[PDB]
Design a binder for this molecule. Sequence first.
Ligand SMILES: *[C@@H]1O[C@H](CO)[C@@H](O[C@@H]2O[C@H](CO)[C@@H](O)[C@H](O)[C@H]2NC(C)=O)[C@H](O)[C@H]1NC(C)=O
Ligand SMILES: *[C@@H]1O[C@H](CO)[C@@H](O[C@@H]2O[C@H](CO)[C@@H](O)[C@H](O)[C@H]2NC(C)=O)[C@H](O)[C@H]1NC(C)=O
Ligand SMILES: *[C@@H]1O[C@H](CO)[C@@H](O[C@@H]2O[C@H](CO)[C@@H](O)[C@H](O)[C@H]2NC(C)=O)[C@H](O)[C@H]1NC(C)=O
Ligand SMILES: *[C@@H]1O[C@H](CO)[C@@H](O)[C@H](O)[C@H]1NC(C)=O
Ligand SMILES: *[C@@H]1O[C@H](CO)[C@@H](O)[C@H](O)[C@H]1NC(C)=O
Ligand SMILES: *[C@@H]1O[C@H](CO)[C@@H](O)[C@H](O)[C@H]1NC(C)=O
Ligand SMILES: *[C@@H]1O[C@H](CO)[C@@H](O)[C@H](O)[C@H]1NC(C)=O
Lengths: 323, 323, 323, 173, 173, 173
Amino acid sequence: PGDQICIGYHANNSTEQVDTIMEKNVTVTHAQDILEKTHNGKLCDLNGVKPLILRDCSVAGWLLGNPMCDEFINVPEWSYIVEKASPANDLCYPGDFNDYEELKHLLSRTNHFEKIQIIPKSSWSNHDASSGVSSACPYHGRSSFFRNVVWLIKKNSAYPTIKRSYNNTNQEDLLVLWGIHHPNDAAEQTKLYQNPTTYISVGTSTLNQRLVPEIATRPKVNGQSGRMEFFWTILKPNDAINFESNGNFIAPEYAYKIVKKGDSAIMKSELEYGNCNTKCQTPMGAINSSMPFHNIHPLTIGECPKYVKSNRLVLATGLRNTP
Amino acid sequence: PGDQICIGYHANNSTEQVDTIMEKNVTVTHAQDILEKTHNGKLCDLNGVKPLILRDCSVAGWLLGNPMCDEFINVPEWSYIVEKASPANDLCYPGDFNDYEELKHLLSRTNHFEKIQIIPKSSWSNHDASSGVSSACPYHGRSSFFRNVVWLIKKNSAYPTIKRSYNNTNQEDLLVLWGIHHPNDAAEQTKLYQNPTTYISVGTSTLNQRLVPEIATRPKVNGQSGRMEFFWTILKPNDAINFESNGNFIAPEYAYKIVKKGDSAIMKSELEYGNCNTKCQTPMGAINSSMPFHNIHPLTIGECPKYVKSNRLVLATGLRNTP
Amino acid sequence: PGDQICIGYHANNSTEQVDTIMEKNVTVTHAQDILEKTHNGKLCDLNGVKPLILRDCSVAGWLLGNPMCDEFINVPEWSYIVEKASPANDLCYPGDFNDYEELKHLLSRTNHFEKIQIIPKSSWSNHDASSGVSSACPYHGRSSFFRNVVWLIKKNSAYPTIKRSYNNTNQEDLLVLWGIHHPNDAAEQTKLYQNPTTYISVGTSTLNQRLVPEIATRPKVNGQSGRMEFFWTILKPNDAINFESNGNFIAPEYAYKIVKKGDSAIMKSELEYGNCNTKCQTPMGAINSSMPFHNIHPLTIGECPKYVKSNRLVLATGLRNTP
Amino acid sequence: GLFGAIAGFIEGGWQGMVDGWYGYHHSNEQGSGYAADKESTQKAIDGVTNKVNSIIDKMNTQFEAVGREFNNLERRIENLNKQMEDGFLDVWTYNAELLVLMENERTLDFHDSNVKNLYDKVRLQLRDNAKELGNGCFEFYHKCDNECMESVKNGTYDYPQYSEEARLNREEI
Amino acid sequence: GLFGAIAGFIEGGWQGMVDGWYGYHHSNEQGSGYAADKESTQKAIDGVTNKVNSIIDKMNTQFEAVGREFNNLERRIENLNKQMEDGFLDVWTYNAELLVLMENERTLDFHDSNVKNLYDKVRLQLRDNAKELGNGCFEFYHKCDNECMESVKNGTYDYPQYSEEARLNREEI
Amino acid sequence: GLFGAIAGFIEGGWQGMVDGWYGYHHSNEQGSGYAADKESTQKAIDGVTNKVNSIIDKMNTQFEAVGREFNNLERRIENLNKQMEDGFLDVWTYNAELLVLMENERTLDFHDSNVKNLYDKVRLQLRDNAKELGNGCFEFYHKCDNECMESVKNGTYDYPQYSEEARLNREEI
Ligand SMILES: *[C@@H]1O[C@H](CO)[C@@H](O[C@@H]2O[C@H](CO)[C@@H](O)[C@H](O)[C@H]2NC(C)=O)[C@H](O)[C@H]1NC(C)=O
Ligand SMILES: *[C@@H]1O[C@H](CO)[C@@H](O[C@@H]2O[C@H](CO)[C@@H](O)[C@H](O)[C@H]2NC(C)=O)[C@H](O)[C@H]1NC(C)=O
Ligand SMILES: *[C@@H]1O[C@H](CO)[C@@H](O[C@@H]2O[C@H](CO)[C@@H](O)[C@H](O)[C@H]2NC(C)=O)[C@H](O)[C@H]1NC(C)=O
Ligand SMILES: *[C@@H]1O[C@H](CO)[C@@H](O)[C@H](O)[C@H]1NC(C)=O
Ligand SMILES: *[C@@H]1O[C@H](CO)[C@@H](O)[C@H](O)[C@H]1NC(C)=O
Ligand SMILES: *[C@@H]1O[C@H](CO)[C@@H](O)[C@H](O)[C@H]1NC(C)=O
Ligand SMILES: *[C@@H]1O[C@H](CO)[C@@H](O)[C@H](O)[C@H]1NC(C)=O
């Protein structure tokens, strides 16, 4: 009999469901997904700057210059570094890298190393800078050695005291590597470096250490039963490093200019380059998303969504939809 | 005069109170307590697996084999480990246990040690393995020494160079302990091991050390003014450990096979066994609860409620009760 | 025209704004600011106990007694300690301070040092305790040295073996400092301490160490090319410390009695005293507030509001105001 | 409360209704008695139960403290470790305490809302066929037998069936 | 929901209404049709959009995990570091998941409130010039053309204008 | 807002009313004036005061940053330490900012609700003895002197006292 007006609300064919405290799977007209769950599964540039992918080399193998890591003899500026879990080409000659992790940390705060010759191998007039070579570090079928560091061995049955010094004349910090050799027994000791008891002394404005070789009988690792122990320091732009040793010294030839310090990272991932580009990278792959969250992997680099462990994050935006 | 219908809500004789942002102590018809506040004040077995209770022994005392710790010569599998705050029976002969904390950590990731004789005490033909004994380490009132480790002493005024080697043929990691003796003076040095300057070198695929005893005069601790320094390493399944020494060597006799690795813990508690069983254990006692929260103690093991610092957590479930 | 009653709500000329999840800048009738944003820019006493301001001396400079740090020869009980980012007077003679951070930490748990002479400087009858002085540590233009530690040098071309001992008879812990000198070459070694090859051994109920000087040629820092390495220990109330050395020993003269243990801090700030008193202190200034939050600096000491990184925290208490 | 029903326009609960949280008290010629609205009660029970279960669920990934040991020269990381543990313990204690306080407040208002909705459910059915006494009770303008009472309670009130006898009773008033 | 409108006294939404969240369905002699209430709809769009943006803004200072490596004798601090990283991930996951739950609920009740308020906006205008059917509809006591309808929608209904036309239709029935 | 009263069916607040949050404006032959409802204003004051204190209280077990030093070969743990301190600072900042945003919304809605409740308190008393103008006012179907007004304000309105003169004025219109 009469005209009427009704108040009502939207409804549609949406199936989007949403959770709240009191009810779960509440179908709604409109929702916004805020959780990213997909990546391209490849390693990419970070804003157009290529990462340093070590393939089968470890950071040590790279810096020390394991002959099987020649791929990296001169690496350009990088955004991040990718290292496999258990790289095959690590220390070809068995041993240790002192404060290795503290060095990897310093690497992750770095984007550019420029290799420079700090002590020419040719300049070792009174020692043998050529037989310092092992089958544990094979190159092209013949015994070789770490390329940035030199295994000085006695010449004409005499090992004169070494007193070499390098003054950093660059404007950059420079990373210097050196090492000490731990022989198997006193015979081998006398065989390689004439003197029976030796030391390696290093001096810097801040550094002062004197390393002495610790002989022991060890199982053979990569054929060798001796060990080589590696050390490092950062030489400030106007500082100098002073080496004095009478044996067992694995001397530096090449050091690294720290050209660009910035924010970087060392990613553990097993995958390789994909020739793509992104603003956000993860160990499982890269992310191109406008979502505020993701559940891919916690360890990321670049402008990223915030990592969260959810399988699902959905905001209700519309209202309760009617069946 | 007329028929009527009323809308109303439940009420009862409840005195249960609940808190909110705007109001405190709100009597309510029904509430759920979600905070467990009681424990049995006892240390108990965890899911049918008894804990290892060290009583008055420390982990060092146990593993090195303090004679006052004979209860633990061959301990069965454990669920968790209980150690007092300041156990009396630690290192009976004074000294240090290197990387001890890192060793306790390894333990806490372990459930079962099977002790094995790695170097028989009988095999010391040209050294004295019988006089390595002290009143600081009393057995049954008689001077003795750590049981799993051997204090080798000169024989016929001679301490020949020792070269023992052990290859782990088991399928498990093996925990090997050894030591060095630091005497009071050059005299004591001579009296015990003939040779005046000594060393101990240990070799492994990964381990390389050469220890030299540091002679000094130190205060008397348990009568002794010398010191013993203990070391450990894990010997991987096809690896071998090489000892070479010409004095001050405290030799391994027994080592420990890591049979079961699991999730365990070293609970610091002053209490002892209770012959009971539980599913959740804390250093103050065990928890028998279905509450999602507890406030007994933060450090727990087993299926446990989540610890919280509240005195009270009660949810309103019913509605505001009327007086 | 009939009688009427209206229900309505308060309004005023208030302009205070407040934020909510759905709406920003909501003008409101009454509001409470709960964020404190102001400080007096001064370092003050903390509840009637004055702070220790190190000015340009570092903790090392203070404790070792750098000649330019005479202000701190006898410091009273303190509330907290203020040290600059890069204090000028640190180790005047170049070198290192062993476990320095752990020592700074122990300090932060301390309110009172009472300096004590443990072995008087005069008592070195058979060594030279007087030429142990350097130009690197100038006093008032005159060459001097650390005041609490003595640089023992050979006397009459002889450095007899040192055997000194001190038994803590006090009721308090005692902080003992000593050091070792690292010369430039074997020549200088003999020049200063007769014996060519040397050691320094320290013994305590808990401590056992034997230090050997590590010679190297280093760049000159403060004119000196040598290095001094400092060590510390806490001597328990009935324990004794035993020094034995034949050279390169930098001996203790003054040690520190820990009179008051409490809760303290080492504040890094560049500003100095303000002669005021407070219950809450920050490295940028002091706080007089009843606010539950502040945003000045995270590192605070005393009864303080909770630090938070917000620019604004304002609670609505009143209601939405009308234009 | 927020919705004006519980301890509001309905000033008090009924000890007498015991088979539920919300319901009716009727009064006709056949006699009076309490009865719970099964539907709105079950809805509330489901809501509160899911709420309780959701609170306990959200807390399964909470921090769990671990025993760790340190020596006299590891005081810094010892303290760092302690601050870390207390840090998370304080956060999660806040989270549990606050969550309970916040959802308690919402729960009380939730019940208030269920009641106010129940009252409105009846009111919107009865319209001018009954008088709002203003205390949660509606005085009928017609005869409401037990079956009629049951129709109001299960949302099947036939308004026009009683419309005429209601209208006539309104107008002699 | 909390406000009794959506899935309450207004049982069900309108598939037919497609240009907004809340609105009107009229039916007179000139014809019937759906029309969206733009102002109250826009107001919600403003509210929910700010809400989503404000949640996203509050989560920008979230924790970000960093790679750190440790050696075989640094197991304690390795474990401390993993416990801390997991600690914050768990804290921040809880924070997001709970905030989403809480605001989802409030967003649904917000809509319920917007509808209930729109219903009241009309009800409070029309008064005794129309009858509450009890299902979200108002049956008029007079003739309401398209011009009348547009006045109700924009809050310009003149109660006394029809009071007399309406009064007549009340009492003859 | 959520409850449709503040900035809703009651459009605008009163500058004139200064002794409370919610209250009345009456208008009879004896004169008009603003007056504060003591009960509802005080109840609100208690609620917000308790709220501010509960917020201040729950934040006392908050994280406290401590100075810790690390050297050039302790960069990893220095970094871990910074991440942890920053981590907790970020958590408590979120916790305070968010808690403030959330209770601010509810504080506003609490007031809105308080007004709608006060209005209903009066509405449920007066019933048909007055007409709802729809702007927060009730125009009486009788004469309400100052003492009658006072009766409405303190919840003691005698409906049957004015019932007959109200009915008479209802039926003449
Ligand atoms: C919510 O919807 C999903 C179905 O899409 C259910 O989610 C759980 O996980 C998968 C998803 O497909 C289902 O197969 C499981 O059966 C579900 N388990 C649970 C939680 O029951 C879920 O069942 C729905 N919610 C409820 C309470 O029924
Ligand atoms: C420890 O002992 C095992 C067992 O004899 C050694 O493993 C053997 O290595 C040889 C190569 O020399 C293989 O041909 C055998 O098959 C291995 N035996 C078994 C059963 O595994 C191992 O090399 C020894 N380790 C060391 C370094 O002493
Ligand atoms: C440091 O000096 C104290 C004080 O004399 C020594 O303790 C005393 O030792 C003697 C003999 O052992 C006893 O007769 C006294 O009764 C002891 N005094 C106390 C405190 O009871 C203490 O042994 C010394 N410390 C060291 C390491 O030599
Ligand atoms: C993001 O993804 C799109 C394709 O989905 C593509 O344009 C590219 O990968 C990214 N966008 C940009 C910024 O180029
Ligand atoms: C809550 O009640 C208890 C007594 O059971 C008491 O501890 C407390 O005072 C009450 N809370 C307040 C302050 O209202
Ligand atoms: C809030 O108000 C202040 C000025 O009073 C200003 O900083 C800000 O721009 C305002 N917010 C928005 C959303 O514009
Ligand atoms: C290094 O060389 C530069 C330039 O000749 C000089 O300024 C500096 O003193 C040297 N550094 C040291 C301490 O040897």
